[PDB]
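Q: Structure for this?
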Amino acid sequence: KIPVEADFLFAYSTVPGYYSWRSPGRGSWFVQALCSILEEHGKDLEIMQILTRVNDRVARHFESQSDDPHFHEKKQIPCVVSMLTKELYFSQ
Amino acid sequence: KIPVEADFLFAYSTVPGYYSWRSPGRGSWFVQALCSILEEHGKDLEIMQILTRVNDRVARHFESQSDDPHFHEKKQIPCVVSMLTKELYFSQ
Amino acid sequence: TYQYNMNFEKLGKCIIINNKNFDKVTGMGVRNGTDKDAEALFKCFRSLGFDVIVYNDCSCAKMQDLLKKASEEDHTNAACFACILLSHGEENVIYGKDGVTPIKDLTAHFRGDRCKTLLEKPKLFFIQACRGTELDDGIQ
Amino acid sequence: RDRVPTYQYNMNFEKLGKCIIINNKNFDKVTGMGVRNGTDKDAEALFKCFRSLGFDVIVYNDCSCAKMQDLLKKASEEDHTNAACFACILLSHGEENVIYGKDGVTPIKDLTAHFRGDRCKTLLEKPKLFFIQACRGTELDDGIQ
């Protein structure tokens, strides 16, 4: 018998309450980061490793630049919620 | 710069909105499991592997049983929220 | 023994909901660049092995139907399921083009007791929406 | 698996870090909460366990809300410069988003906020772990299969 909430995984572009940054020209930071990591490691890294790397890339490589002082040099950190009960690999 | 929310990891014994089981003589499910896996692999498994295994353990190995039918034969699934940006090993 | 079994015919279905244009009644502006994201995402997930389909400017009823139907399909030969929501968001809710819907309502359809063919299989949700208005100033 | 270059947190410090355990077993009658039999067993298993990993562990018993807030706040104002990380384990009654002290309820977010990067510069870029054993609602999982 297994829990009805088990084996779900949510990857949010940002933590609860914050703003999610998106470049109208190059798309959002989260997606840019997710796609690059996936294009290069989607088949050899476990889901959590990938999402952790995405976390790092979004945290470092990104920092906004706006006119309004309220939106300048702002950062972002994605959030992963996992109820998985096994390691996930998109291969073999 | 670094986001103020970065590098945080929350391991909840149960998912949002649910109940968490505990034995008056054995201790809680989540803790029993956590400690078990940590004894064995704490020094050679990445934190997410350890917690994924704890998720599997609580989800499978346990099932409640009280005199009351309402709390009889219920399951539990831990919940991990990660804002980490690197893999965590407690050794080397 | 510690990894989900990927030994299946299909990797799984991947639903991408890409909301760019919202009703004036919502007061939400156009989400420029979301199409750039949707396309990139389509290639990645397709490339991983997902049978991805992209739905645009969905209403809240539309998204509920898409996810309900998808949960009623037969995933017996699927290794997992994935859903990607690109839209406007607020704490605990995602934006349809005609209003807002609870994320928990979209994902609930796949609970163990409501989608037998995905039982013990991974169900992934990638949400690219806002969750609040607070800004992370950073440090150091 | 494979420990690839710097995709891992640097664990080369004088110490692994501090591990704070809050073991709440007895609560004031007014809160309506009952004794949490079995919690000492968890506190013992946990303390031994985290000591084994190399953590400097401290166990607190039956804390008030003010005590938990204060205790955590002072932990965030210490010098963690020579620590690889920080851990905190909370064992108590809880409801969504809140954890019980012996005399009441306090938001989990407020307890962990003390360690944000802008409020605890010596744990910046270092993992801040929180293990929480508390209810988060009343809904029971019936299961399937």
